[PDB]
Amino acid sequence: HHHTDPMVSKGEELFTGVVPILVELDGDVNGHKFSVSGEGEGDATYGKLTLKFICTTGKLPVPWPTLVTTLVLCFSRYPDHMKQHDFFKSAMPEGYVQERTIFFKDDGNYKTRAEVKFEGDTLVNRIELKGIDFKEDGNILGHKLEYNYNSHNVYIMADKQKNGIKSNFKIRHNIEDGSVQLADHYQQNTPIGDGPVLLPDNHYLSTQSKLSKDPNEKRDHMVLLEFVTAAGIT
């Protein structure tokens, strides 16, 4: 609402209230083609997301928790003293590309590319996902993961050469038998536009996610509440 840096003001202004979100994913995992649509709202003031996702092609062929990181970090809450480090909002409204490779230990990998940008007043995240080399009897295609999600801190670093950011981090998915399925993420983000962006000092994001079901919904779906806060600069 009041920042002495006009570049920060420009990005904050687009995220000042509740912003509607649309998520589209087209996926192919070991030749099972599927699509997911999601709708909800983001409130960057509190770092809060609320989304509901539907598999529009029938039953989702992989477990919903494996898609949480893939299915909008511009809604992170950056403390006032860290707002000059917020790459994600500084790239708006033209947006950014978010690319990942996700390696599931002892199993296959996801390769994702997403464009995150405004269409009018709506923040859209449009994703293509390709998954290969998964085991039919593994934890992913065998749906052995529990329907829950662990809190996680992720380290963000600038990539000055690409005018973007980079991160590598591990997600632990609980398996029904009490064990864990590791998912190693590599991520890079680059701006879509050619204007300047804020390139951050090293810092981390703290995330927490809660998964639930809509008791009146017959389609395969996931309801997601996420909180993300930046930290690590004193």
Numbering used by the authors: -5 to 65, 69 to 231
Quote the original article.
Reversibly switchable fluorescent proteins (RSFPs), such as rsEGFP2, can typically be converted between a fluorescent ON state and a non-fluorescent OFF state using specific photon wavelengths. They have been widely employed in super-resolution microscopy and imaging;36−42 rsEGFP2 in particular is a β-barrel protein that can be switched from its equilibrium ON state to the non-fluorescent state by 488 nm light, whereas the OFF-to-ON transition is achieved by illumination at 405 nm. In the fluorescent ON state, the chromophore is found as the anionic cis isomer, while the neutral trans isomer is responsible for the non-fluorescent OFF state. The motivation behind incorporation of chlorine in rsEGFP2 is therefore to obtain a construct with photoswitching capabilities that resemble those of rsEGFP248 but that can be investigated to confirm either HT or OBF.
To obtain a ground-state room-temperature structure of the Cl-rsEGFP2 OFF state, dark data was collected in an interleaved manner (1:5 ratio) with the pump–probe data throughout our TR-SFX experiment. Minor populations of a twisted trans syn (named trans-TW) and of a cis anti species were also manually refined to occupancies of 12 and 14%, respectively, as well as the accompanying alternate conformations of residues H149 and V151. In Cl-rsEGFP2, we observe the prevalent configuration to be trans-PL and presume that the transition from the planar to the twisted form is no longer energetically favorable due to the steric hindrance introduced by the bulk of the chlorine atom or to an electronic substituent effect. For the scope of this time-resolved study, we expect that any observed photoinduced species result from the trans-PL-to-cis reaction; since the starting population of trans-TW in our dark-state structure is below 15%, we expect that any photoproduct resulting from photoexcitation of this state will not be detectable in our data.
